[PDB]
Design a protein around this nucleic acid. Structure first.
Length: 78
DNA sequence: CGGGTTTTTGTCTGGCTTCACACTTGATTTGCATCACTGTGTAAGACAGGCCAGATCCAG
């Protein structure tokens, strides 16, 4: 917070990417980049909105599907 | 119109990873084209024509 402005999460993921590249890995690096950016392993709200609308899903139906996926998989895809 | 002072970076430098890259063939798994059909088209209004009724007219 003294000289680097004061953003904690930024320094955190930067140090993690540096320590990861130290191990010269690309798989994990790309995974965390996609997670932190919001492009892989998890849909944007507009994307799931388009899916729910263009497939005629009811709100109740969509909630049922969301609940089932979250219960079985354990990871929030929608 | 271009001098100071940190940012922003590709290297120099050579030596350690973790993935990349030739071949099979028999499956196994995805991806995509094809075919006979579907729904949404969904109540009233204008006009001519036959028919008596009753008004319009005729003549003893």
């Amino acid at each position: 917070d003294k000289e680097e402005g004061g953003d904690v999460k930024a320094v955190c993921l930067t140090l993690f990417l540096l320590a990861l590249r130290a191990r010269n890995e690309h798989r994990q690096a790309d995974e965390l980049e996609a997670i932190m950016q919001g492009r892989g392993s998890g849909l944007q709200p507009a994307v799931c909105l388009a899916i729910r609308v263009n497939t005629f899903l009811s709100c109740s139906q969509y909630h049922k599907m969301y609940r089932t996926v979250k219960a079985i998989t354990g990871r929030q895809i929608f």
